Amino acid sequence: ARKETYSSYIYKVLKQTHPDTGISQKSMSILNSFVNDIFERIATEASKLAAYNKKSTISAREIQTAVRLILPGELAKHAVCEGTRAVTKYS
Amino acid sequence: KETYSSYIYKVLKQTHPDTGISQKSMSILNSFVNDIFERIATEASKLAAYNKKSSAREIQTAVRLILPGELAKHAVSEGTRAVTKYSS
Amino acid sequence: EDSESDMDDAKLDALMGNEGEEEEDDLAEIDTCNIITSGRRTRGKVIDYKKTAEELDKKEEKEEDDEDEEDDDFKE
Amino acid sequence: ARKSAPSTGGVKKPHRYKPGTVALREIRRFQKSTELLIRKLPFQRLVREIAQDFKTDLRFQSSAIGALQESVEAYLVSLFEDTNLAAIHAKRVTIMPKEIQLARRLRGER
Amino acid sequence: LNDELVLHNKDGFLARQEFLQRVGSAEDERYKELRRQQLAQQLQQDSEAS
Amino acid sequence: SRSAKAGLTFPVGRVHRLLRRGNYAQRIGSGAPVYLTAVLEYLAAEILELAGNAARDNKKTRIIPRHLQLAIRNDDELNKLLGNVTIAQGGVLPNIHQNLLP
Amino acid sequence: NIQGITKPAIRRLARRGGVKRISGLIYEEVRAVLKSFLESVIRDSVTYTEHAKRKTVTSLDVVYALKRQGRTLYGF
Amino acid sequence: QSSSARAGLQFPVGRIKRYLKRHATGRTRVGSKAAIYLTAVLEYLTAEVLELAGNAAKDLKVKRITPRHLQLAIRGDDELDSLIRAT
Predict the structure, then answer these.
(1) Which residue of B8, B36, E5, E19 is most buried, as measured by CB atoms within 10 A?
(2) Which cysteine pairs make disulfide bonds (chain H)?
(3) Under an 8 A CB cutoff, do D77 and G9 touch?
(4) Best CATH choice for the domain G1-76 from the list 3.40.309.10, 1.10.20.10, 3.40.50.1820, 3.90.79.10
């Protein structure tokens, strides 16, 4: 069959950050598992929060609020910084 | 606003008909019902996420996964009774 | 197999934005929360080699080289 | 007798009770208690005095303040049980910060 | 007895009371300044020593 | 309605509608709309029996929430399957140590 | 307000907690930790009060905060 | 052009859109901007951890990122340790 994962994309991100260094096998497995866990937690929190707000208007604000309420200040604030810049560049 | 008040009263008359109720107990029992239901459903969905899936067996196996066997056997028996009655 | 995945991503990048009443964020959005400190992309910091670890825990050949060799270097 | 009274006063008499038995009877009477104990109005006063720092005009509801009171009141009691068990595990029937810190570092504060 | 009223009310009870309210607002703002400095120090120490 | 067809006291049509609105997965077998309802009735029935005997213990016809707490805290299995919930109108079961009392 | 839970209130809470003798230098740290817990829960409550920027806090907000805080509560 | 290229980033949005549509709850659905923001956040965190692990490997003079370097970077940034304990 076929499998889908973030090998090439994470490698590209690292090359942008550290071109000389790569990613090893189990280190990639660890990173992929952690990023999947983070995505699933954010998605579940956004879904249950939107259900709590009794409105079917799920914006980037749902993911933003999730990021605030599941992750400490530093990483969340920097992520929202870069996400705001990326969104206003796309928009 | 479909609540379980009528169902709760029915199960009260079934178990201890002579026993009365408070004015806040029904909220506690309704919370028990729906929160147990949603957590069991979430565990069932997370278990079925790995297996390719695009009923009675899934609910029964989710119940048997985590919920204690002392209750799981009764749950399986009553679920089989319910599905047979539905098919009847 | 990355080409078909990228094509599927590009195709799906347009279906999700027209799934009903969305009108995302009212075409506006709050700026960098608190203060702007993300830098360009990262912090640009490193770590040391010596007892700096013993300074770090006070501030708060993996699985053998055969397994270090076992983990194949990823090729895009 | 301070002043005019039902004949001769002083009927209170020296009737001091030694501790231990009094402590046992008061804890026995307190255990059966099931309702709220601390005053609720100072509680809402303090919780509103510590809410405007985030923002003012937040407003509140009786259900809210009641739920926070229930959450804070039903959580520190288990802490009290753990501290008492850690205390009488050692030869210290009284409570000192040592066993409460012990409980903090075994209940996973982080 | 009219002119003395307006020569006395220029700096009377109400003016002095309002001035005391001004100084109270000033010292409350100073307390706010102290609070923000202290909390900022707490945030700095939360990452400079942990 | 649905209860008569299923032969079960607790309604399942509303419960099944809630489950369908949940959309927990792409494959949602609809052949057992009352399975979760069945298990919840069984659990609540045993809980009600425990609460009823506890209330009859202290000549209390009406179930005080303290009786409910005692019923849900007197069994090893019940406290094992959930023990992290603080119920309103608390009060732990009486206990004493061999050192505090003679 | 620092002196919300006063000395007799903390004393009777401790007696309800089944302690033989309560020393006179134990309530300060307990007050500190419960104030920290209260600050955490009110911070969470004000966060989800702005989930839809609702201008009022209700039992739903605090039960949300407590149910994701790990210390689940019941009676409702 | 491609929406991912339009955002000026590396992470692709479509994968997160597909994996997030699973989290739809009947009448409740999710939007594309939420997925774009999630991709931005994921790219940021992966870039941060990759930079930290690459610097740690450069300290070890290793051209390949090691999970021990990942955990050392997590330990150094206490926010990451608190997050991984929370999640």
Answers:
(1) B8
(2) none
(3) no
(4) 1.10.20.10
